[PDB]
Amino acid sequence: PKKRASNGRNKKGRGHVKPVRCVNCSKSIPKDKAIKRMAIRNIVEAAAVRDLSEASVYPEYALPKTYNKLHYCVSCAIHARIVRVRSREDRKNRAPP
Template sequence: MPSKRRNNGRSSHGRGHTAIVRCSNCSRSVPKDKVIKRFQVRNIVDDSSQRDLREASVYATFMLPKLYMKMLYCVSCAIHGRIVRVRNKKLRASPEGRIYVRPNFGGKGAGNSFAVCEFLFFLLMFFVCFLFLFLCVCC
């Protein structure tokens, strides 16, 4: 019978059995090599509370510690929570499809790529004008 994926959805090459872990979302038992792993780094408090703490603090340069969590998702929760996406057969088989780039759902850096390109364009134009003026003055 043909298999859907090259690795059959697991990364246990040469191992018969792997440990069982629990999904962070629904507590389903999932083999450790099949689980989708994401490392999440968050601030302990939100930005507004962080600003209040900074204003009330005696120390000028006190940095609040961050919260480091390794999230383990079963396949169902990862698809439902948009951690991973369903890919068609051609994309799964191609080398480009194996490299997964997480989509940015309006988070940091969303929509400002045009602004960055525009800034770089103006910077380049400024440099060209400056170079032109410099050459005119020197000659």
């Protein structure tokens, strides 16, 4: 039978949210069901930070990361990213990590 009180995900007092598109497979999905992550990462990376500053002007410069919000589609969310599948209980747990 029913196997979530949030049903799909997060929708109480509305009836129609609005669809966004999966970043991975372009599948439409109700934004409130979407499953999202902020991709904040540095512009450079791991090792490049030394060889960066070394062959640059300015003192150490500044460094300005990238920021983009990722929308996945369940199937896509499950096939790789945040998902695993949790036990009938751990499921309920909304707390991030």
